[PDB]
């Protein structure tokens, strides 16, 4: 909505024992005379004006700058397929990615690794994230959730394996190319070192580790 109007939502989300029964305040009984302690008519009027405008549509539109892309049907025909941005889902994914790093469990389980220990559990890293900042200087124009997560799309990588691996060289110097400039290649080293890590282990659960040892070769 309008950025000047967001104080109304800040009043609705005033967590007096929950903001779900106040923003969608359909089940209020004592709050009515608290909205207007002068009458009972304008109290019900303000209650309807607050809870009625939070479910309204108008008309379906996409104002010539949104996306709408054809989809080929099986026999013949098309559907227009105008997509939208799923801000609750992008909120929930960003909150999981914030909980896995800056949380209490990750802070506890990283201190154990700085000291080479055991502890109840482990942790994760989430590499190659990217930032896509929707609001330029003031994110209140787009969304309230775009203001709580200012800019900060927090996208996840779908890259090819060899993307940051540009190198151009010819082995004119060394005689044997398998021993030298093959292990010196950037990707082969983490295959070979993990193979040294895997070729000294237990053979009791062979059905998975032999498959991993075969796929790594």
């Amino acid at each position: 909505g309008n950025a000047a109007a967001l104080d109304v939502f800040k009043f609705l989300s005033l967590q007096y024992q929950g903001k779900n029964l106040l923003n969608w305040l359909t089940e209020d009984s004592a709050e009515a005379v608290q909205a207007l302690s002068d009458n009972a008519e304008q109290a019900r009027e303000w209650r309807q004006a607050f809870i009625g405008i939070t479910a309204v549509k108008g008309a379906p539109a996409s104002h010539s700058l949104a996306k709408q892309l054809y989809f080929p049907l099986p026999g013949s025909g098309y559907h227009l397929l105008a997509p939208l941005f799923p801000t609750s889902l992008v909120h929930h994914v960003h909150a999981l990615l914030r909980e896995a790093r800056f949380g209490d469990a990750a802070k506890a389980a990283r201190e154990a690794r700085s000291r080479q220990e055991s502890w109840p559990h482990g942790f994760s890293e989430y590499p190659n994230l990217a930032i896509q900042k929707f609001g330029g200087t003031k994110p209140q124009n787009i969304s309230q959730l775009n203001s709580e997560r200012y800019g900060e799309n927090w996208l996840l990588p779908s890259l090819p394996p060899h993307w940051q691996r540009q190198d151009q060289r010819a082995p004119i110097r060394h005689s044997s190319v398998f021993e030298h400039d093959f292990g010196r290649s950037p990707e082969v080293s983490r295959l070979t070192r993990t193979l040294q890590r895997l070729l000294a282990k237990t053979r009791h659960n062979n059905f998975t580790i032999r498959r991993y040892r075969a796929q790594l070769v």
């Binding site: 790093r101 800056f102 590499p127 940051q164 993990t194």
Partner: protein, 94 residues
């Protein structure tokens, strides 16, 4: 009030500790993932191998790696401090 261990929480993932035939060699990881197979890339010193002394105990090699990170590569310490500030700002939020 950010101690060296709070920065060391998020600085540790740029090192890798490989047990070798004599001991516990260490090396520096660029992507900050622990030197994994698919996502990471560990720099190799020029003989090719890890840039680390062959410490007997793993705490010694971990401390050598982390002290060399604090001493020489200050941009990685800057990334670790920028993470460590938000690590307690997130606790200040919830």
């Amino acid at each position: 009030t950010i101690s060296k261990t709070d920065i060391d929480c998020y600085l540790q993932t740029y090192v890798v500790i490989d047990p070798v035939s004599n001991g516990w060699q260490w090396g520096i990881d660029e992507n900050g993932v622990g030197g994994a197979l698919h996502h990471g890339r560990v720099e190799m010193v020029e003989y090719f191998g890890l840039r680390g002394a062959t410490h007997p105990t793993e705490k010694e090699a971990m401390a050598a790696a982390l002290g060399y990170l604090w001493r020489c590569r200050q941009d990685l310490v800057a990334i670790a401090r920028n993470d460590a500030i938000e690590a307690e700002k997130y606790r200040a939020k919830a």
